[PDB]
Amino acid sequence: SLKGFRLVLFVKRYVRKMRKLKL
């Protein structure tokens, strides 16, 4: 991503963890 606060990173964090739950 071309920067843009961390919130936008926190959204793709919970959505990225959903696809494949790490551990």
Q: What do these coordinates show?
A:
This protein has 23 residues and is mainly alpha-helical. The chain contains two helices and no strands. It is elongated, with a radius of gyration of 10 Å. It is classed as lipid binding protein. The entry lists the keywords Anchor peptide, lipid binding protein.
Q: Secondary-structure element sequence?
A: HH
Biggest beta-sheet profile:
none
Shape: elongated
Question: Roughly what percent helix?
Answer: 40-55%
Summing up helix and strand content along with how strands pair, one would put the structural category as mainly alpha
Radius of gyration: 10 Å
What is the tally of helical segments? 2
Distance N to C terminus: 25 Å
Strand content: under 5%
The number of E-state strands comes to 0
PDB class: lipid binding protein
Keywords: Anchor peptide, lipid binding protein
Assembly: monomeric
Entry title: NMR structure study of anchor peptide Ser65-Leu87 of enzyme acholeplasma laidlawii Monoglycosyldiacyl Glycerol Synthase (alMGS) in DHPC micelles
Q: In summary, what is this structure?
A:
The PDB classes it as lipid binding protein. Keywords: Anchor peptide, lipid binding protein. Helices cover 52% and strands 0% of the residues.
